[PDB]
Amino acid sequence: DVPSKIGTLLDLSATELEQVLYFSKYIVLDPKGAILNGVPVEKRQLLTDEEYRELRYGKQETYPLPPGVDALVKDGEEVVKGQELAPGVVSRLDGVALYRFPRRVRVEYVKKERAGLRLPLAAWVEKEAYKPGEILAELPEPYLFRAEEEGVVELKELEEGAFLVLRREDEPVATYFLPVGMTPLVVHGEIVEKGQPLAEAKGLLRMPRQ
Amino acid sequence: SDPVRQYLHEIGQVPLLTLEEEVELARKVEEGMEAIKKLSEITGLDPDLIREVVRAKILGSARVRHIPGLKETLDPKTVEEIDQKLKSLPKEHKRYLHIAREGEAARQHLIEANLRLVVSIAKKYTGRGLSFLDLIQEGNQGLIRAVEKFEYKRRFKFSTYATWWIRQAINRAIADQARTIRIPVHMVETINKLSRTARQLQQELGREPTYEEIAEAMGPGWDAKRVEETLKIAQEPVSLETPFYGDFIPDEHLPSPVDAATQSLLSEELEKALSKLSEREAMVLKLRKGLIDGREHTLEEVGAFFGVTRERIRQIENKALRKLKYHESRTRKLRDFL
Amino acid sequence: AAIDPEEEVIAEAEGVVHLHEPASILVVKARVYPFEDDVEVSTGDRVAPGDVLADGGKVKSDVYGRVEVDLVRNVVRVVESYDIDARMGAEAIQQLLKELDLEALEKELLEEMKHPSRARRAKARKRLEVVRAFLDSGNRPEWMILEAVPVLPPDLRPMVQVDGGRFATSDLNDLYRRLINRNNRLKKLLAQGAPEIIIRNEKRMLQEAVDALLDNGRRGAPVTNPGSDRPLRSLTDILSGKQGRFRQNLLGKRVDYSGRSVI
DNA sequence: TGCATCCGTGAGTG
DNA sequence: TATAATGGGGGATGCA
RNA sequence: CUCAC
Ligand SMILES: Nc1ncnc2c1ncn2[C@@H]1O[C@H](COP(=O)(O)OP(=O)(O)OP(=O)(O)O)[C@@H](O)[C@H]1O
């Protein structure tokens, strides 16, 4: 009934009353220290749906990643606005990033073994321990690592560098380590005797990175 | 200003679930259900009450009411007591609470993310007696029913299973609310069967069917009479304000002045007979004819008000009438009173 | 884990876990808070800065937020959000009309009546006319909001059986049914804990029902019976108009002891 | 400039 | 109760 | 739609 008695009683427009009554805009009864777009929420202010979800439930955004394409960032990492998340995906805000569904789970299995390695005396540097990437020995000339046992070869390579397991029956008799700079001369499932070269070391050899 | 468009816009805000997210939410819901099922075992309380409290804390403080079915009245005080009794559990017992909260919170998003289906389902049930938004607000209840019954282990997408409950909600709502005269669902189904049958008969004959053709095409137990009666009870009442239609309709209930007159002249010319008779004579007649209680008391019951048996009462009655019959033809008042 | 016992990824031995190729990346504007011992807050709770989160009160919150407990990563999240109270419908309006102290508004409006600029005096005058109307009457503004809706007696909107055994009813009956079918539906949707969209839509439809019962066709479109473009006769259409109760049944009736003939 | 509200009486027929 | 289905179909006057 | 103004 123009002019709206209720509307004129609360300094509310016809549009405003239409929005509040018929569920088009939220009207605030208690800000509780809230702030929208820089300004603190004042009572009797008209919030929309987005303005209400942002203030009441916070803001967030899920970005689709192409099937197969991995993410540049990792899980639990803080992100800035405009910061890249994937080779083609850019984030539109700041905050904590979360991996939705990791299609591939890679498990780095911890292994602790014991292996032997023969090297010329003047060619090896004496250390009680060896960090990854650190030079284990420097050979002035091509030296061939030779088998000290006889049996079948179990070859087990890594990302860089490799192992070697000599065994009779299925019981292991020898475990040799071939660092970065030691090229194997045998294959998997090969019969070797005592004395024959299993690998060649040339130049500087060091521990692998892993 | 348009509820339809407004609701369509409000529905286009919640994104569509990926298969992974779908299975995630469903799984979380089921896990929540089981978690509450064990929490009730731990606390030794009531599953419905517990899940209702979890719902309460999940939705916030905006929604707090006593739920029909729960024994305790859900006020913030009580839910505070219960929530404090939920925080009073060991780490391996208090860990099911988080699963309950997760279950409800995932249930909400699951319902919200599958609301666009109800629209596309109820879009074709239009013009049945209920409006678009009513069919939507019933199909939504059907969806709510579909959530608490879904089993993700069966590898079926939630759409396939929800569709059933949505249709089941709509087709019930229409059959329960569309008529001014509410008809039991099965009867409505019968009437619909009549409609489709008669429609087929009309389509093949080249003319409209009779009651007999319908009754024949319906099967055994069906005769023309039952078809006619079924069509009689299937009638939809019409409006009085139809261009009014209710202005050409008399008021049969209330007595007119002519009616009120004679009824007030019948009682008058009758208590002229409570006189000429006596006090007890003009009372055996009142019980017998039902002037006092409205019901006719036999000469059996009547005997227990004067002591007399069923044959002094009879002579008590016939003395009244026969005397009243002689009081007639001398006053001759009651003749026309027909 | 998986559907069946098979296909399950079981750790062969000791090692660490890494995740690659995510389906998507959920960027949340929140604050993380890891824990060692039992957590005191459950997920979904509202939290202010400096509230006892987990580990017996050691780790806490920095900002206003919503609690999101992660048991997989074993971390309590806080999504930056306030406990703001903003409502809708004729409930918030009822509250705002209840919060009114008409005396104070009379004071204020009287204090603004001294300002020039033409229009201010006028608006203050009208508003103060409404305020003083409520003050003198003794009526409360919140009564402009309906909790309990009155129901007209049956005979004044009768369902009667006509001459041919058919039934004829008033238009108020279908409106009342339209009201109840949404009120009860709302009462079911509330008890069963429905999402906000559904409840909002239901309340909106309820309002659409009371605004069709009292004055059909006033706002938006008039509700019609299926199969006709005829608006149902509301309680406003009954009283007002040339066909209204006033001009048709109070200021001029049909009478007994009256005949008509060609002169 | 948009919206809401008014726009003569009694009577007959289907 | 479980293929999957996910966004509709004139005519003038008073008053804000 | 018709009668009277
Ligand atoms: N009383 C009547 N008797 C016969 N035909 C009528 C009558 N009223 C209307 N009609 C028919 O309807 C046509 C015009 O009707 P119109 O729509 O102008 O009346 P209406 O709008 O129904 O009147 P109201 O709104 O007062 O009921 C007439 O030309 C005539 O054919």
Side-chain angles (χ1 to χ4, degrees):
Chain A
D1 183 33
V2 175
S4 54
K5 304 295 150 49
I6 303 181
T8 51
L9 243 187
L10 295 181
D11 194 29
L12 294 175
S13 173
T15 299
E16 302 186 328
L17 243 193
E18 161 77 0
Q19 291 167 344
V20 176
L21 287 180
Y22 292 86
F23 306 89
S24 182
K25 269 188 173 57
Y26 288 90
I27 187 173
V28 283
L29 276 62
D30 189 18
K32 287 290 188 57
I35 152 191
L36 171 64
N37 299 328
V39 287
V41 172
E42 197 70 4
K43 194 188 175 184
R44 299 192 174 195
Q45 182 188 0
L46 301 186
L47 297 182
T48 69
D49 221 327
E50 297 78 26
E51 296 177 355
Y52 183 72
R53 289 197 298 265
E54 178 181 347
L55 264 44
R56 177 77 171 184
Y57 297 142
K59 62 195 306 176
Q60 63 197 53
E61 191 164 345
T62 291
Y63 304 94
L65 249 71
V69 172
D70 197 18
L72 305 179
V73 297
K74 279 226 304 176
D75 183 275
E77 177 191 343
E78 214 71 26
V79 193
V80 205
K81 184 177 182 179
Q83 180 178 351
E84 204 177 10
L85 266 44
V89 175
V90 185
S91 182
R92 293 232 243 96
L93 64 144
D94 289 63
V96 180
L98 276 314
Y99 278 161
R100 286 308 304 166
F101 307 97
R103 310 238 183 90
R104 175 172 56 89
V105 178
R106 177 181 297 190
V107 180
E108 297 276 345
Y109 286 99
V110 176
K111 296 179 179 297
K112 309 169 186 177
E113 296 279 5
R114 172 178 173 266
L117 177 59
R118 176 169 300 275
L119 281 157
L121 179 55
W124 99 285
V125 40
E126 305 187 357
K127 289 189 177 184
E128 192 108 9
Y130 289 91
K131 298 176 60 180
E134 188 180 21
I135 311 178
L136 174 65
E138 175 195 6
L139 307 98
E141 50 189 357
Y143 158 79
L144 314 180
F145 177 83
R146 300 185 173 276
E148 291 192 357
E149 289 286 354
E150 353 78 32
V152 74
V153 176
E154 177 207 337
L155 184 56
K156 191 177 186 182
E157 308 178 19
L158 294 178
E159 192 168 358
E160 62 177 16
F163 267 12
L164 211 162
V165 177
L166 253 35
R167 50 158 51 91
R168 288 187 290 269
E169 279 89 337
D170 202 43
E171 303 296 334
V173 74
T175 307
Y176 304 139
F177 167 62
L178 310 183
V180 182
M182 180 85 71
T183 303
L185 295 176
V186 290
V187 303
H188 195 130
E190 182 170 352
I191 293 299
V192 290
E193 311 177 40
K194 267 186 292 186
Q196 58 178 107
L198 299 181
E200 174 187 10
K202 194 171 185 177
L204 298 84
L205 52 78
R206 62 253 259 87
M207 303 274 298
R209 301 147 185 166
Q210 200 87 336
Chain B
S1 64
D2 181 29
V4 184
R5 170 174 295 186
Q6 198 175 32
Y7 180 80
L8 292 193
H9 183 71
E10 289 183 356
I11 233 60
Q13 300 297 275
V14 181
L16 262 178
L17 285 180
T18 319
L19 180 62
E20 303 154 327
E21 296 177 311
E22 198 167 325
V23 179
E24 173 192 357
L25 294 182
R27 169 178 57 90
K28 289 177 173 295
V29 173
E30 196 160 344
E31 288 177 359
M33 290 297 301
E34 293 179 344
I36 299 165
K37 283 186 176 62
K38 301 192 63 178
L39 254 172
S40 182
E41 284 271 344
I42 302 177
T43 60
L45 255 42
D46 190 276
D48 306 320
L49 175 59
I50 294 179
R51 72 176 305 217
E52 217 65 64
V53 174
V54 177
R55 270 179 177 171
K57 282 304 184 303
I58 282 297
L59 295 175
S61 62
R63 198 175 311 176
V64 272
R65 57 164 293 181
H66 56 74
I67 315 299
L70 277 65
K71 297 178 297 181
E72 286 76 11
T73 163
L74 266 61
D75 44 83
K77 186 196 311 300
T78 301
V79 316
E80 267 297 327
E81 302 177 7
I82 303 302
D83 191 30
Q84 293 305 325
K85 287 186 177 182
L86 284 169
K87 298 170 185 176
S88 301
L89 287 184
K91 186 181 179 181
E92 74 282 359
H93 283 3
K94 195 181 168 178
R95 64 108 50 177
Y96 291 154
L97 181 60
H98 304 88
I99 311 300
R101 297 285 188 91
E102 274 282 341
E104 300 297 334
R107 171 179 175 265
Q108 307 303 287
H109 198 330
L110 181 63
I111 300 179
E112 293 177 297
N114 284 271
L115 282 176
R116 314 193 188 195
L117 185 66
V118 185
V119 174
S120 57
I121 288 186
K123 74 154 75 173
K124 296 168 301 176
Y125 289 77
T126 55
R128 299 288 216 87
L130 294 181
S131 59
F132 198 9
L133 270 66
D134 287 277
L135 302 176
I136 287 184
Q137 287 295 126
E138 287 283 351
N140 286 11
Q141 288 178 155
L143 176 64
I144 293 182
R145 293 266 48 81
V147 166
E148 302 178 0
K149 286 289 182 298
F150 183 78
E151 298 171 346
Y152 74 101
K153 295 185 177 182
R154 303 195 184 192
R155 291 163 42 252
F156 304 120
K157 269 177 162 295
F158 182 64
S159 58
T160 305
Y161 180 68
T163 300
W164 189 94
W165 286 92
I166 297 173
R167 299 188 195 274
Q168 205 68 22
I170 298 177
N171 293 278
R172 181 217 66 89
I174 299 180
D176 190 36
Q177 300 177 356
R179 292 175 179 259
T180 305
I181 306 297
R182 180 193 169 275
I183 307 297
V185 46
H186 58 89
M187 191 64 57
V188 180
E189 297 173 355
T190 299
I191 302 173
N192 287 258
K193 188 178 181 181
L194 260 75
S195 298
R196 202 177 70 90
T197 301
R199 181 130 78 254
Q200 273 291 337
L201 299 179
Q202 172 183 316
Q203 286 190 17
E204 58 188 9
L205 286 174
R207 60 164 176 84
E208 287 205 14
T210 65
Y211 291 153
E212 294 76 21
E213 303 184 285
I214 298 174
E216 171 210 359
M218 289 292 294
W222 283 99
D223 60 329
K225 170 180 59 62
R226 198 157 143 257
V227 175
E228 186 171 359
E229 295 169 351
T230 301
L231 281 186
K232 183 54 188 297
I233 49 183
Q235 291 179 341
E236 275 273 34
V238 84
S239 178
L240 287 172
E241 291 78 0
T242 311
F244 292 153
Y245 176 82
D247 298 329
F248 314 110
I249 303 177
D251 180 86
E252 317 285 350
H253 183 79
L254 265 156
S256 76
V258 177
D259 315 326
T262 48
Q263 180 181 24
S264 187
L265 298 194
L266 182 43
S267 296
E268 247 182 317
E269 281 192 351
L270 278 205
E271 286 205 1
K272 292 181 178 178
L274 291 186
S275 64
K276 299 167 171 178
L277 300 203
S278 68
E279 295 174 331
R280 276 195 174 183
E281 293 169 338
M283 235 300 300
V284 157
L285 255 42
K286 293 193 175 186
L287 295 170
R288 280 288 309 165
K289 300 296 157 61
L291 235 115
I292 324 165
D293 318 87
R295 185 182 60 89
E296 293 177 350
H297 314 287
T298 357
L299 25 61
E300 321 155 0
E301 297 181 312
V302 171
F305 291 102
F306 306 115
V308 149
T309 74
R310 313 133 153 273
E311 288 189 318
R312 320 169 186 173
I313 281 293
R314 292 182 56 222
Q315 73 175 5
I316 269 177
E317 173 163 6
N318 269 286
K319 180 188 179 302
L321 309 184
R322 199 180 311 126
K323 187 149 82 172
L324 298 171
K325 204 162 301 185
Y326 283 116
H327 285 296
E328 276 188 353
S329 305
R330 285 179 181 175
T331 81
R332 291 176 173 174
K333 307 176 183 176
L334 312 198
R335 292 173 176 173
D336 336 85
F337 271 75
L338 306 174
Chain C
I3 305 298
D4 0 42
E6 57 253 357
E7 310 165 11
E8 282 199 36
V9 177
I10 314 177
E12 284 179 282
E14 179 186 343
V16 296
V17 185
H18 301 260
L19 293 320
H20 296 270
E21 301 187 34
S24 55
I25 302 182
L26 174 55
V27 176
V28 187
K29 187 184 178 181
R31 311 281 268 271
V32 292
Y33 307 97
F35 59 92
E36 299 173 334
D37 204 29
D38 177 37
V39 52
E40 304 301 324
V41 291
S42 191
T43 165
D45 297 330
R46 294 291 173 176
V47 136
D51 290 329
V52 278
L53 259 57
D55 299 341
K58 294 195 301 179
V59 55
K60 49 183 57 182
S61 177
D62 301 332
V63 300
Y64 292 101
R66 196 173 192 261
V67 173
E68 188 163 321
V69 175
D70 192 335
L71 293 181
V72 173
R73 303 181 181 94
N74 267 85
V75 54
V76 175
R77 268 175 297 207
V78 170
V79 194
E80 303 184 9
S81 59
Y82 318 91
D83 195 29
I84 178 180
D85 187 325
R87 306 180 186 179
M88 279 179 167
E91 181 183 7
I93 300 301
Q94 183 187 19
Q95 188 61 31
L96 292 182
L97 290 180
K98 282 181 179 181
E99 293 181 13
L100 275 189
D101 186 29
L102 305 175
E103 318 251 345
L105 189 51
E106 183 183 27
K107 298 182 185 301
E108 182 179 1
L109 288 173
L110 275 174
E111 294 291 344
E112 201 211 4
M113 274 288 299
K114 298 131 67 176
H115 192 270
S117 61
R118 300 186 297 185
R120 306 247 284 199
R121 286 173 295 185
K123 300 307 175 183
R125 184 193 68 232
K126 301 179 180 180
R127 288 192 54 178
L128 187 51
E129 281 184 74
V130 184
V131 169
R132 268 205 176 97
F134 270 106
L135 281 171
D136 301 335
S137 61
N139 297 321
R140 281 266 69 197
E142 72 263 12
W143 294 347
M144 295 183 289
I145 267 68
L146 280 178
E147 298 178 357
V149 165
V151 163
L152 185 75
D155 289 342
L156 306 188
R157 35 163 260 273
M159 171 91 68
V160 296
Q161 197 173 22
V162 295
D163 189 43
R166 294 276 303 202
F167 269 94
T169 179
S170 180
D171 281 17
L172 289 186
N173 285 331
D174 282 22
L175 296 176
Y176 273 142
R177 293 194 308 103
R178 255 178 57 99
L179 185 69
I180 305 172
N181 279 328
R182 303 186 178 187
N183 184 73
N184 290 344
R185 190 187 302 162
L186 180 55
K187 287 181 58 181
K188 181 194 175 185
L189 280 177
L190 286 183
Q192 293 187 349
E196 285 304 284
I197 307 180
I198 311 180
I199 298 298
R200 176 190 317 213
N201 193 73
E202 189 61 40
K203 295 171 57 177
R204 188 190 327 181
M205 287 174 50
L206 189 65
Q207 173 74 4
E208 205 78 9
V210 240
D211 294 341
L213 167 68
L214 305 185
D215 202 340
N216 186 23
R218 180 71 282 272
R219 197 207 82 97
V223 48
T224 74
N225 279 332
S228 63
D229 305 331
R230 186 186 69 89
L232 305 186
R233 200 145 191 264
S234 61
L235 287 145
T236 291
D237 306 337
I238 285 178
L239 296 182
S240 60
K242 190 172 64 178
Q243 263 291 148
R245 190 63 66 208
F246 284 103
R247 298 176 62 172
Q248 191 96 7
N249 298 97
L250 275 309
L251 296 179
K253 311 175 175 62
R254 290 190 176 270
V255 286
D256 295 330
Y257 303 137
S258 63
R260 153 175 282 256
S261 181
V262 169
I263 53 179

